[PDB]
Design a protein around this ligand. Sequence first.
Ligand SMILES: [Ca+2]
Ligand SMILES: [Ca+2]
Ligand SMILES: [Mg+2]
Lengths: 198, 280, 117
Amino acid sequence: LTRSEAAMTVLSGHVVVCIFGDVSSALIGLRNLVMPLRASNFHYHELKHIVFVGSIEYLKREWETLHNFPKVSILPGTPLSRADLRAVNINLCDMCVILSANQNNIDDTSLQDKECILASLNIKSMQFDTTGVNIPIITELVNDTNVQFLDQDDDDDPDTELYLTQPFACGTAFAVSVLDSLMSATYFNDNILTLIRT
Amino acid sequence: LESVSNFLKDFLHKDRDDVNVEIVFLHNISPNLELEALFKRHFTQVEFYQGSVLNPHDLARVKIESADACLILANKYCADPDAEDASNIMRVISIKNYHPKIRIITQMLQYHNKAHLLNIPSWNWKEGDDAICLAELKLGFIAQSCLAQGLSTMLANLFSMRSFIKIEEDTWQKYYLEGVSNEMYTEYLSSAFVGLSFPTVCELCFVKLKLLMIAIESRILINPGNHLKIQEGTLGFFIASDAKEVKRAFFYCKACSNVKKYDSTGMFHWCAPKEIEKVI
Amino acid sequence: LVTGGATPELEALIAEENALRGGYSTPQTLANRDRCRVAQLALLDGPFADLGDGGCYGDLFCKALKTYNMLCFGIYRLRDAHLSTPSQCTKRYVITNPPYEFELVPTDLIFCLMQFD
Ligand SMILES: [Ca+2]
Ligand SMILES: [Ca+2]
Ligand SMILES: [Mg+2]
């Protein structure tokens, strides 16, 4: 797509995916996110549309595994562009998903989730003819201590565990560090990994 | 050492009035012996506490919930302007997250990063959040030197606090320093000047009070016409030697056609988007 | 003063769309042009030129303000103009907010804010 066709194509109940890709960034593997939405125990009229916003270079470095799926679209823009997020009907989606690929290349532990946090704040600071705070949003963070910047009404404490933090308790944030108990669970009960996988 | 030394020279200058605002520094590096000596030379006005601005515990330690404002200095000579802007953005995010209602003054190297920052939900420019963009202000000052050469020097010298310096030699430097001794101030002006024209109060203030007015508080009006009458309770953007002189402005009572030519706001010229090869 | 106006409307537009968008002419657009513009003017010709050698800056400030709604915050004076001997140097320097008693020389330029027509 581009600005024109994105704005005139009415979208509602869709999934908006915000990608901070780069030509040197690692491959996220968006196949694994698309396939559960595309599963066949949903009727075809019930399939939520998917649109990806991000660097066109990174989209043409991953599209080679996403061309057999329906209801998908690309918009070659910036996840932080207010014009793009307005053109994509962000206020009418069933989810916005924010992912970053530049997480391992840099080693600062401060700027790893800066783009995701800024995008989340920009989406929550939007005025619609309702505010942007009620939008359904999920973001993936590399550092668990960065979850304190996602919300402002909640009380922040570095000692507080991620599972106990308000944005995680609400399903607004997700980090790969919560999966570490799957080693122990899998070992004790060999069927649990397949029950979860299915 | 140089950043704090320059900041304290301008904040604590004798040409301001008798302000007793305490300065509290928050930094995660232990100060070297020359910074500790600089803080000892300011022992009653400066306190330092070692911590990270990203830590809510440190923010509570420096009592940022009751501070009048938070100032965020930037590394202008950094190797990576993008990295510096990102770090400053993170600092602003942390401070606003701890306390949304804190006045934040920060330096921003670029203008797109400034646009990125102003989307913060707690970022309120009306309440007093000022992002001093260095590239923007310097390019604006260079452009004003294209309308009148020397105006970048004229503007820059109005902010830096400077005392009068005088020497016996008849040199261009004496006159230049005498001119440099004046800063731009702001204060409320006497009921004895309400009901008069702006040119009239300017020719009155000029040498009788020894004060020059550039503007007044339809709010911010640069050099008003002769048709504008001074509102009761207004403030004047004086240029003066110091703050204790502009007190006179208060303390006086007769002590003698479909063409799109412009932008959407009607403030800049505009044209359709030209191709790059057309203008090469 | 420095960017030639950036009112809250323009700061919203550049935050939402990140380009200047062209507008059709309106009466409010033609009213928004009235704001002063910074200028230099010469002291060798025009109505101010009777302030030749030995004139007072206070006289110039007063007549400019009284008659042209115009006032000056400084003189862009030639570096060597305070010397007795003629020099080929054309370099000037900014004198800010000088006294009413301050002395003019005929080769000078004046910083001022001027009206719109
Ligand atoms: Ca928080
Ligand atoms: Ca001064
Ligand atoms: Mg003390």
